[PDB]
Design a protein around this ligand. Structure first.
Ligand code: ICS
Ligand code: ICS
Ligand SMILES: [Mg+2]
Ligand SMILES: [Mg+2]
Lengths: 522, 478, 522, 478
């Protein structure tokens, strides 16, 4: 039942006695549920070193992964180009999911089409789907560019995208001069970040490969910036802001920050902002190209080095103090622009914050996960703060990356208790935070379930989650944050120290038991 | 308010955008309701392939199998079999609620996957699958059984998951259900429902045929309620207040045991016709268990449904139905008095999957609201047949609506509220149009039953009358 | 005792058995402590309507105030002027506390001097203190201006500041043309905000009263902005940013944002930025003066209207959507500058966030406190969000203010359950959140103790604190936030929604009991 | 690294900044240690008025009475009597820890005030004060008694708080202690200590003089430990492990009953000489209770202190002291082995109130660190006498240092670490110099006792060796 002046939703409605009784009868009468004691005993066993051993011996099962599939990344990349429709050649179920996943993270519309290949196309291939699809998409949604990627069906069947698009043009489904860059994005290779790399290199090739004759390195006096798979609006914005403050001419190649943040002013805008085709066409005339997330931009890098002849600087993701410094110094060198007083002051304000907060941060132990570049930047900054990153998980990481991270750890005393895991999942991570308990986890919304598991063992074992990464689905508007630059470091620092203090307040809020340390001033 | 002729002119205008082939097709999927129409002639085409490139809202057969029918079964482990995408996007995105200790005796919010790599494409994944089942037995020993939810590649590479399953089931002493719900099959979620219902028929349902069970004359199963926000629980309670005994729930908060005992019940109560008519009809064929359709959205339909269900039993149950209805009337009257005056006369457009586009109309009407447009992603003609009587005259109808169509229709009809999914929500908010998710209940609900209706009314009022809607235009642009 | 590789601080050290036993003997042997049962019974009684009755009948005792004293505000005002040293004529104990209070909030140095009046001066007065003090301060710390306020001692004995400063000049302690504006700031009138008003009007008079002959309204084509007592760096910054974006010529009169945020770069900077003397001297030539916090700038307003002849617009604090809109439209009208695209889009993004988050915010009940302008802006925004501000407390509020807030409440349906309290303290508020429990409190760090009290009654009665206001001492770097403009509204919205969701996750984290509603996606 | 001559030259250079009068005064408050001095000549002038306008770190007599001595007494209510400022700024700023149910039987972190308005200035606050006591009895019935902590105005307006207190105490049957700690009195926190010690003497201490008490040979009181971060508890435990019975703690975690029983003890153990020598001396005069100074900072001083305290009793306590010291040796040696190699050879400057500028030197030396500068806000000559033996030769000394002086000394001496208060912390951090709060323990501690020393060493290392200090210079400015 309900009181109408105080209506209860699922929580706490189902805690009402009548519901409790009914569900106790359901369980006992009809579910043949294991007895509680046995559930308790098995739970206990899932928290042990013995269970962890069995867990890490898995060779075939993946549980609770911490990656997605390539075309997810291809779509995000495509969204960053002016009046560009993402188009995924293959099965439509995929596009429904890609859109939902991003809708839930950004709380925004996400525009993407499928060509809806079915069983009919499973033997003969999707040539007709491509012809009708391109024509329908162009007329219905009026993009200036359609960026084509693939689902696993199309990859398995082996559709030749190049031929299908060229035939679509030859037979008048779309104009010859209408831009349709493409990439194979197999979901059973790499991950979402690989998809972004592949899509990006596809678009770069489309507008530059056949027109290299007139290009001269440095002639436009700009720096290209490739951001990679990035799901924080603040990150796109902070890079632009810093370069503009330095007076550095730049082109951000794939810039979705406008279309992922349109105003609610009475009108729906399918398209907004984005990198122009002119920018991509002119990009070989830049002084150089900077890759903000190099560990998932390897194909892009080979193209930019091999065809554009740019000497891509060896830069880490500009996260934390050192790596932001090095990014700015390199941009200074390439551009000839000095680092201005505003950025100098901003840096020192970050360092002020570090001095002010160091006592609470020192020695704190973190589990963390995410994409390779993000993870290593977070690792680096944690070391700069005097924190210990004990469990470092990158499901979609490789051996070369792990070695680079292991060397970062080995150069700091705060790295001594750290291990890097690649190819491991969040069920692996769950065991680690039981057997070798840290203070906190840093990761995405999927971590909430690990936090729940730890609390069930007992309050003293609970490992709180700090949400930084992708996706974040159970909080609102964190997609507006920043994790790059001094600005991102300040926000990360603040989140960390206040998580520590918040948890300390919780633990010291017990009247007459723990509140002796419930200090007003920290 | 628009005339049939104007609505029909709207349809014609919107179709102008498409190439001829697309136009000719889409013209068959858009209609205006006319209940003084033909007995046998369809009003609309349905359950056909989506056109390429037009931005359908539809998903795939894996969604309808793994996401919809199987995923909710709380004490089995469902393997997403293929590359890593499908399981990750579908991980805990549907609020099919359950009671359990997750990771120990229940597994619903977890993602189990075979995470196919290129090696698995080239050499096949049968060996991988066999090892996975072993590893599952080691690490999750309280699982009652396993389902294998095929993603696109399994069919295309010629893996034999039926063979893997039958050998593994013999060894481990539990059902291992192979499901051929690869996403290239069918046109939508719909065929996944069908494939999934058949996998249940063929691998689970008959296991206890020989066995005795302690039965009563009042034993029922709730078929096709996935317990979104506790929807099934707020339904179940009314059925028990009425004197019935709910032996099984398919598949919201559901278990293997419950499914396996369902052949012993006296009556199958079908809420979601679309998704589970298949198994309902199988059960009437093989076991002689009748099934009836009901509707638990809003007081009108609940009363109708309770009386109808009760009349299948005896005078006692019928007396009971009258008691239950009377008990909740003061609540319903209080809810209507509070919220109906705030919603009276407001117009709604809906777009959902296979049921709710017709099923929720009664509840809106209990609040004085009118549905001026509705449609389905993947309904069949039998669903459109059932929609006609539920709809007002000259109501706009749309099957597998395109992104473009839905936007144009909304701009013209100017509804006060839209009820659709997550892919639609943030579009219409930008237009200044109140929007409520009618799949996820916008993280609210339940909406089924008497307790559900009070939450439904609060939510419609909360959103439709919210202050935020008065603030979209900057004062210096008026 | 201690494990050296895992050293325990007070928490959890004193939870060790040996310490627990020792303290149990201390209590039983030596403290003559009331029995637990009796403590329980009295605690219970403090949570009741009966106790609340007695509590609100207080006429003489104040418990846990929510205000400070005038000179604290005078100091902050003074800090906002270039190379200005705050100088408090009177007792030195005061300045020790003022400095500490700001040090703890801002985690920065806070420079202020006393003239250290002692018993010697208690009969004869502090004339010699002023002479030597001015001279010593000027030589030691080399300010360009010394801004004088008073402690309660000097007010009680009745020192004539004007005469003392004039005598300091006549007798050669400081140069005649050295700027020494002053104000009487009695701690037993009004509050800290009153002190800011008094100091500001003092400085305005110092630089303008005798030189009005040559002034012409509008001649410099600027708008003056007086911010009032403000302890969020973001607030000063966002006002500047918005005006600059509009291309509006302005003077921020009292701008401490630089000196409250110097970089840690190896050098201590006692002074930084601030409003110039030139800006104050020229301020009568502005088009007009806008007061951001009019409910504590009444004296300033009388001066600006009576002597400058400025037609100060009737504007509320620019908090929330409507009042930010009104501020921008007024500045547009006065300046002739159109409101630009960038601010228009920023507004629409705020509105987007409101549409995205409204379902979680709807009907949430809040207790809140702070200074009058801050409180009413928070009330206004809560109404814009569909929240109910049930307990509205302003210790330093007056009857005219209460009436203005009551009218704001009456213009919204969400105001129906609200009461405004003036002259009440946080012990009053404690009773209200027990007898008429809200969902959350919004206030300063002093609220933490109310949250502890509510949890002791039981988890179901706990009212979580959301820290917005001053002071905030138990979290780090929240002083960098914004509460004004669209930017401030976005940050407040984000904080509110995520407090709600955080608390919902806590309530639904119980395995197999409440985690049915522990949803990934919210 | 600096000669006496250089230090003396530093002093002369720093004094150049001042006008003549100020310079003449300040020259008396700055010195260089030389233990080859006539131990009857003063090394430094102390406990004099601050110069106007020079930015002393010092507080007022209210701070030393309310903030320091009285405030920690957990089961009494301390009224800040006057306008609202003093109580607010002093609300929970000092970590004088206690165990209780705050608002019910303890009141330490609350701010009770008479919040004087203008009418109270003009007409006097005595009537207000009387009503306040009534209101307190109504609303806080478990309070064991009340103190009245006078702020500047009480004395200046001629209120008679002694009369109010006498009448109110008779009525309510509990001590009501009037304290004339107005902040214009004295020069610093110091006189507030003295006023507060006398208020205890005159209004609390003798109440149980007639009465019987169950005494033992080993009854002691800890005098002058305010339990900063649990300092007194980590002291108490050692004294009880040694076989003594701590009847009272003054005033960290202290109660009225404990104070009132203190005249029954066999020995007063004085940690903070400055703040509570007065009451210690009174208790020796009136009751014949001896008092001894001790020091629980660091293993060297703890051992010395335990053996010294034990030798006042009997052979058994002395045996016990040897047992306690031996029990903790493994711990101390582990702490030294871990942290002393990271701190060896590092230089420290201190500036604190009345005790810790000398008392913590031994602990720094147990980690191989050297104090190259120290000073006090408000010490007296007797404190400086006690500092000489604790100090290294040619150590810089500063009494009531000015903002300017402390900055200049730090710039020249270039210490590796500074230990001072909140008003100093953020200055030196900007200069790139590690800083640890030596009042608040930077929200850490305890630092007293064996358990305290482990935390002290961790903290010094944490801060001195922190990575943040290598990062202050932008790499493009090197
Ligand atoms: S199963 Fe169907 S799309 Fe009947 S696939 Fe879909 S939880 Fe919809 S209109 Mo999401 S035929 Fe259920 C449905 Fe309806 S997932 Fe839920 S809301 S009543
Ligand atoms: S009482 Fe004194 S200033 Fe002896 S007023 Fe001060 S808690 Fe200091 S050096 Mo704050 S004579 Fe205690 C002191 Fe020492 S408040 Fe604490 S640290 S040992
Ligand atoms: Mg949005
Ligand atoms: Mg700082």
């Amino acid at each position: 039942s309900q009181q109408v002046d105080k209506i209860k939703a699922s929580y706490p409605l189902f805690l009402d006695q009548d519901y409790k009784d009914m569900l106790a009868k359901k369980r006992d009468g009809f579910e043949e549920k294991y007895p509680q004691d046995k559930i308790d005993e098995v739970f206990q066993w899932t928290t042990t070193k013995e269970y962890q051993e069995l867990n890490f011996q898995r060779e075939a099962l993946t549980v609770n992964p911490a990656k997605a599939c390539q075309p997810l990344g291809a779509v995000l990349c495509a969204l960053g180009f002016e009046k560009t429709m993402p188009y995924v050649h293959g099965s439509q179920g995929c596009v429904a999911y890609f859109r939902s996943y991003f809708n839930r993270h950004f709380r925004e519309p996400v525009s993407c089409v499928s060509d809806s290949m079915t069983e009919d196309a499973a033997v003969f291939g999707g040539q007709q789907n491509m012809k009708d699809g391109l024509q329908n998409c162009k007329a219905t949604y009026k993009p200036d560019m359609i960026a084509v990627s693939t689902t696993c069906m199309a990859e398995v069947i082996g559709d030749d995208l190049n031929a299908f698009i060229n035939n679509s043009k030859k037979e008048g489904f779309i104009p010859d001069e209408f831009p349709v860059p493409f990439a194979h994005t197999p979901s059973f290779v790499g991950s979402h970040v690989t998809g972004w790399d592949n899509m990006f290199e596809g678009i770069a090739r489309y507008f530059t490969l056949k027109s290299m004759d007139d290009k001269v390195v440095g002639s436009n006096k700009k720096i290209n910036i490739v951001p990679g798979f990035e799901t924080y609006l603040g990150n796109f914005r902070v890079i632009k802001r810093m370069l503009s403050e330095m007076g550095v001419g730049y082109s951000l190649l794939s810039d979705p920050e406008e279309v992922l943040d349109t105003p609610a002013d009475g009108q729906f805008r399918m398209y907004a902002g984005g990198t122009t085709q002119e920018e991509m066409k002119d990009a070989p005339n830049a002084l150089n190209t900077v890759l903000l997330q190099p560990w998932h931009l390897e194909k892009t890098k080979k193209f930019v080095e091999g065809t554009w002849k740019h000497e891509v600087p060896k830069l880490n993701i500009p996260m934390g103090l050192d790596w932001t410094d090095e990014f700015l110094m390199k941009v200074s060198e390439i551009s000839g622009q000095p680092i201005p007083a505003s950025l100098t002051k901003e840096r020192g304000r970050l360092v002020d914050m570090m001095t002010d907060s160091h006592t609470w941060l020192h020695g704190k132990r973190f589990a963390l996960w995410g994409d390779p570049d993000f993870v290593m930047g977070l690792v680096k900054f944690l070391l700069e703060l005097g924190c210990e990153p004990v469990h470092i998980l990158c499901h979609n990481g490789n051996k070369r990356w792990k070695k680079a991270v292991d060397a970062i750890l080995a150069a700091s005393p705060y790295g001594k208790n750290a291990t890097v895991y690649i190819g491991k999942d969040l069920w692996h991570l769950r065991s680690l935070v039981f057997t070798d308990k840290p203070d906190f986890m840093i990761g995405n919304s999927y971590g909430k379930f690990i936090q729940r598991d730890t609390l069930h063992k007992g309050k003293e074992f609970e490992v709180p989650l700090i949400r930084i990464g992708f996706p974040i689905f159970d909080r609102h508007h964190l997609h507006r944050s920043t994790t790059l630059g001094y600005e991102g470091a300040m926000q990360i620092l603040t989140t960390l120290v206040n998580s520590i203090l918040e948890r300390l307040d919780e633990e010291t809020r017990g009247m007459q038991a723990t509140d002796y340390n419930h200090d007003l001033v920290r | 308010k628009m005339t049939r002729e104007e609505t029909q002119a709207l349809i014609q205008e919107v179709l102008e955008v498409y190439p001829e082939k697309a136009r000719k097709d889409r013209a068959k999927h858009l209609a205006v309701n006319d209940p003084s129409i033909e007995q046998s002639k369809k009003c609309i085409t349905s359950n056909r392939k989506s056109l390429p490139g037009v931005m359908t809202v539809r998903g795939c057969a894996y969604a309808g199998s793994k996401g919809v029918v199987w995923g909710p079964i709380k004490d089995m482990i469902h393997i997403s079999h293929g590359p890593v995408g499908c399981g990750q996007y579908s991980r805990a995105g549907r609020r099919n609620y359950y009671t359990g200790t997750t990771g120990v005796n229940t597994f619903g919010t977890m993602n189990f996957t075979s995470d196919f790599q290129e090696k698995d494409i080239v050499f096949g994944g049968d060996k991988k699958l066999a090892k996975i089942i072993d590893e599952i037995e080691t690490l999750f020993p309280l699982n009652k059984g396993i389902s294998v939810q095929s993603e696109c590649p399994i069919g295309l590479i010629g893996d034999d998951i039926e063979a893997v399953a039958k050998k593994a089931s013999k060894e481990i002493g539990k059902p291992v259900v192979p499901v051929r719900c690869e996403g290239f099959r069918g046109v939508s979620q719909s065929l996944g429902h069908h494939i999934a219902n058949d996998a249940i028929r063929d691998w689970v349902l008959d296991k206890r045929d020989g066995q005795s069970f302690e039965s009563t004359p009042y034993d029922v199963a709730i078929i096709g309620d996935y317990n979104i926000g506790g929807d099934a629980w707020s339904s179940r309670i009314l059925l028990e207040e009425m004197g019935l005994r709910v032996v099984a729930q398919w598949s919201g908060d559901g278990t293997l045991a419950e499914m396996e005992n369902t052949p012993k019940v006296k009556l199958n109560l079908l809420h979601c016709y679309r998704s589970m008519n298949y198994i309902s009809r199988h059960m009437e064929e093989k076991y002689g268990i009748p099934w009836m359709e009901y509707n638990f959205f809003g007081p009108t339909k609940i009363a109708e449904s309770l009386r109808k269900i009760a009349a299948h039993f005896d005078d006692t149950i019928q007396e009971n139905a009258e008691r239950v209805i009377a008990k909740y009337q003061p609540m319903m009257e209080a809810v209507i008095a509070k919220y109906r005056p705030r919603l009276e006369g407001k117009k709604v457009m809906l777009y959902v999957g296979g049921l709710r586009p017709r099923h929720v109309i009664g509840a809106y009407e209990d609040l004085g609201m009118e549905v001026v447009g509705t449609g389905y992603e993947f309904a069949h003609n039998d669903d459109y047949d059932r929609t006609i009587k539920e709809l007002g005259d000259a109501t706009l109808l749309y099957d597998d609506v395109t992104g473009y169509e839905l936007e144009e229709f909304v701009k013209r009809l100017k509804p006060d509220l839209i009820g659709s999914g997550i892919k639609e929500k943030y579009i219409f908010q930008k237009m200044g149009i109140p929007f409520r998710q009618m799949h996820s209940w916008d993280y609210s609900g339940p909406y089924h039953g008497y307790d559900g209706f009070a939450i439904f009314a609060r939510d419609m009022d909360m959103t439709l009358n919210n202050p935020c809607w008065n603030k979209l235009t900057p004062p210096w642009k008026k």
